[PDB]
């Protein structure tokens, strides 16, 4: 790799996110602010996405 | 040397818990 080469030529850092949605306990959650359990009411719920 | 297996080897499949059905 050359600083002369044209723009298709050139490297480019590359990255790939790979991302396990599996049944299993999750590990890596997004930045969501979690709340106290609710019980016997009906209610919307979200555990782990 | 050899024998026969019989009815062993089987794993659960999925990560996912179920109860009570005959599952495919």
């Not at chain 2, 026969?4 to 009815?7: A, D, E, L, V």
């Given at each position: 790799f050359?600083?002369?080469y044209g723009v298709g030529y050139?490297?480019?850092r590359v990255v790939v996110l790979?991302?396990?949605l599996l049944h299993?306990?999750?590990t890596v959650c997004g930045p969501k602010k979690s709340t106290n359990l609710v019980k016997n009411?009906?209610?919307n719920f979200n555990f782990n996405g | 040397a050899y024998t026969?297996?019989?009815?062993r080897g089987?794993?659960?499949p999925d990560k996912?818990?179920?109860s009570s059905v005959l599952h495919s």
């Open positions: 050359q600083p002369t050139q490297p480019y790979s991302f396990e299993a306990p999750a009411k009906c209610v | 026969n297996s019989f009815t089987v794993y659960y996912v818990f179920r």
